[PDB]
Structure formats: structure tokens, C-alpha cells
Amino acid sequence: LYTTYQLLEVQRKLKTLPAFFLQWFPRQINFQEDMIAFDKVIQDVTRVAPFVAPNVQGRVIKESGYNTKTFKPAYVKPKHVIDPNMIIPRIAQRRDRVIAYLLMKHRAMHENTWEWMAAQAAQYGYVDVQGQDYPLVRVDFGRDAALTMTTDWTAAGVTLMDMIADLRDGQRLVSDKSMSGTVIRDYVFGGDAWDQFVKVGGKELWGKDGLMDSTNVTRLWDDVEGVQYMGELVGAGRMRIWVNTQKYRDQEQFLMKQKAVMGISSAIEGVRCFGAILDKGAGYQALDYFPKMWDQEDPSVEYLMSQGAPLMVPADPNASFLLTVMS
């Protein structure tokens, strides 16, 4: 058998393709107990108590909800049988090879969970997660309601100057409503919003005198399917244009709202928060993922399990906006 330390050496050694939305969640807190403290994350002294309510059949049950300074994150726990005879696309040598593939698959399950939690927190200001007594609960971080907009880019006589002004309103509202007052320079478009912005913008956007300047965070996405850096939109305020068409799997959905545009700043200063994983003898383990191997009977197999308890909390919930453009 291998110790957690030995399994972490393997699990952590390789490089994994960059996460798009988490680039705005650079900070990290590995909490010492089972609870996450928002007072140690959220900047706004009025917004340090997010509203947590059960999400039952899509509907948020606000009645049985409360404001809380502290949260108990549910464990993300992939568990797989270690079969040395397992089919891997590329005796003890093969056993180790199986463990490493499984550890990589587990690390991916945790990493993608962080990314989708980042996507939801940044886009909506709230994240739907697994609860303690309910299968799903909503953690509302209280982003200003003016930062969730609606417009119709499919209406008659809409121009590129009108579309940029919708985007600019959003960044000016962020400047007004955010702690820092940061000027947004990044605009993540969903695929339908982008196609819409290009349907209307055409000649004025990509032509001989286009606004798009198509010419090192912008080049790390070349080999990433779903992410496309389009260039800076030159304005007499040079906007960075991102298009996100990434999909993930639910027990397959789009990471970014396809018919919307999200504006975001580095001032969101999102924090990857992690609860400590309780271990019988070793006590609490403050880790992002925690691999454990063991032999058992009933069934007579060897198991590998990577446990983690995450939440992606924004420091400044008001440092981003979402603008829906179609229906």
C-alpha cells in the first residue's frame, strides 16, 4: 500500500490544462476544521453573511434559508477499485500505472468541480452546491441586483456602438458598486452572444478598419477547446474579448451562459476555500484533495479515494457583472 504523502507525489507531479474561470480565483484558504469562515474571505462587512437556502427541484426554498458567517462544505469523494488488469490507453509495475491513472482521474474530478464553482460564482454571484441535509443548496454571495442585466441584441436597429455601450454600462456599474472601483477590461462571451455580437458588428468589428486588434495569459488557451481569446476591442478603453464554449458533465452542460456576456475584473480576488477532511486517527487534514488507499473485504478489493471539501468564494462579489443578450 501507499501513504497519502506517496500518492500526492504522483497525483501532484503532472501538469493539467489551465482552468479558465479559476484564473480570477488566485487566492486559497485551506481551513483547519470542517467549516469555512466567510469573515476570513469576503471584503464587504455587510456581505460577510451569505444567504444559504435549499435548492429543491430547481426552486430555491428561501423560507428554510438563513444568513451565515460560516459554511460546512460537502465532500467531493471519487472512489475506484484498483484493478492491475485495467484498460488504459497510454505485475506491481502495472498496479502503480493503474493508481497513477486513477489519481489523475480523481484530481480532474476535483479540479473541474473548482472550475464549475468558479464559473457560477463569477457569472451569477451565487453557487448551487451539495448540502449537508439537502442534496443541493444555493450559497448567495449578495452581488448587487443591478449587476444582473438583460438586453436584446436581436432587436431592430441595434448597432455595434449600442452593444459596446451595454458592456460599458456594466463596467461603469461595477466601478460604482465594487469596493475598489476597478475598471473591467475582460469580457467573457458565451458562444450565442459572440455569434450575435458578430452578426451585428460585422464590417465595423472585423473589417479593413475593424475595432478588433487580433494581434502572457491570452496565449495559454491555444490548445484549450472551449476557450478562445479574440483580441482587444480598440475604443477611443481597449476591451479583452473572450469566448467560452466549454462543456462539463452533470450526472453535459455549458460552463458559461451561452446567451450572455460576463464582465470581470481581477478585483473579484476570488478565494478557493477548502474544508478540512476529518481522518479517524490522523485528525483533520487541511488539503484541496486527499488521496487514501486501502485493502478491504466485502467486496475483497483494494480502493483509492481522493476526498475534498471545496467552495469558490469571491472576495468582492460586486467586481463582476452578467448581461443576458437573447432568449
Residue numbers in the entry: 4 to 93, 109 to 233, 240 to 260, 264 to 278, 282 to 357
From the article:
Here we have determined by cryo-electron microscopy (cryo-EM) structures of the head and tail components of YSD1, a phage infecting Salmonella Typhi. We investigated the structure of the recently characterised phage YSD1 as an example of flagellotropic χ-like phages and more generally phages with long, non-contractile tails. Samples of YSD1 imaged by EM showed characteristic features of siphoviruses: an icosahedral capsid and a flexible tail tube of ~220 nm in length. Cryo-EM analysis of YSD1 allowed structure determination of the head and tail components at resolutions of 3.8 Å and 3.5 Å, respectively, and the generation of de novo models for the major capsid (YSD1_17), auxiliary protein (YSD1_16) and tail-tube protein (YSD1_22).
To investigate the assembly of the major capsid component, we determined the structures of the major capsid protein both within the assembled head by cryo-EM and in its soluble form by X-ray crystallography of the recombinant protein (resolution: 2.6 Å). These rearrangements are unlikely to be caused by crystal packing since the same compact conformations are seen for both of the independent molecules in the asymmetric unit of the crystal despite completely different environments. In these conformations, the two structural elements form an inter-molecular beta-sheet with their counterparts of the neigboring subunits within a capsomer, which results in a circular strand exchange. These quasi-equivalent interactions observed in the asymmetric unit of the capsid ultimately allow the formation of pentamers and hexamers with different curvatures, which are required to assemble the large T7 icosahedral shell.
